[PDB]
Symmetry: C3
Subunit: 144 residues, 3 copies
């Protein structure tokens, strides 16, 4: 029967992202100006903090964030997703064939009802170069 | 209630894969001869191009591709999944304990109704050696 | 409508994990003493072997295991998930910004009805240092 809530975004320098994502650092992304590719329900909404979870929406969430920045083919792409006190990370070695990275997660999210706390945060970068030619996709879906 | 469509494949030199996957290159996999491990519905079907999405099947898709080739324990395993104009990648450092790699994604797929365009494409390799001893699994499920 | 079965665990030295996870080796985790963060249904239960699948529960499973051990920022974090004869792996380069790793999978699980065979096994480590300051999360959900 599908899922009750979901949000899929496209993030780039033209769609709400920083003109240049600094090298070797992780600053959470303001997602208010991201392009909404698909939306289901009203429990997940973009904001300057990341992706907000509406009250009463505790449960299991499937999350994916990917990045391609074909001009940066060296170093490692660092990706991070946070929720409350938990944070999840991964490092993806860059190459000409894999100019970017991916992080996917199935996590349990407890919603306290404090908008500034109930938010999925996202960030990524390359540890050796700035990114100003990226296509980033962020999708989250409540599967239970 | 489960999902409406899903396909899980097992790909090897004995089940439709190349006798030898060339090193440091990414050629999309012909999946017509892959072993169907599990199948749900009729929206996702294997083909020479990858995994076809039937008309009217736009939505959210959960995808995973993994590989084990225990004889190749050096370099990085490069994995890639494509759909339309988007492509997702990841690099996984090889070791004797981790002789392979993994890429998982939750992406939104828009189905235009052009079989040759509406297809999930898959490819992987090792950046320093050819693979001729691999077990590859590819699973895709429409979750919304 | 959500999922029929799911289990989300929090594993640490205080919640059932080894006082010290040996370097460069993969020993499956005894999950009997892990903290149950969320539980759905009765098909997935923790045990000394990993996460048990109840009889009649064959199907598609979404799995994620993550680790953070902020004091170990070098080498690669090696993660592995096994089920029956299949095993899936990934390596995640460590850094101060990414002190850990992630592995996510959508796999098909055939349940034979042999408790000691129908179990998801988990293990991870750092290839250059022991881990005694970790927060590990393991979540599995039957999506079909």
């Amino acid at each position: 029967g599908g899922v009750t809530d979901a949000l899929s975004l496209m993030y780039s320098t033209s769609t709400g992202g920083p003109a240049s994502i600094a090298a070797n650092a992780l600053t959470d992304f303001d997602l208010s100006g991201a392009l909404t590719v698909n939306s289901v329900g009203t429990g997940l909404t973009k904001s300057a903090a990341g992706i907000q979870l509406a009250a009463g929406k505790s449960g299991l969430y499937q999350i994916t964030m990917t990045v391609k920045n074909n001009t940066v083919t060296t170093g490692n792409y660092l990706l991070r997703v946070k929720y409350g006190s938990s944070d999840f990370v991964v490092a993806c070695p860059a190459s000409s064939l894999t100019a970017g990275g991916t992080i996917s997660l199935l996590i349990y999210c407890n919603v306290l009802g404090v908008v500034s706390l109930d938010v999925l945060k996202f960030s990524l970068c390359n540890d050796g170069a700035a990114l100003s030619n990226y296509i980033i996709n962020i999708t989250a879906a409540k599967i239970n």
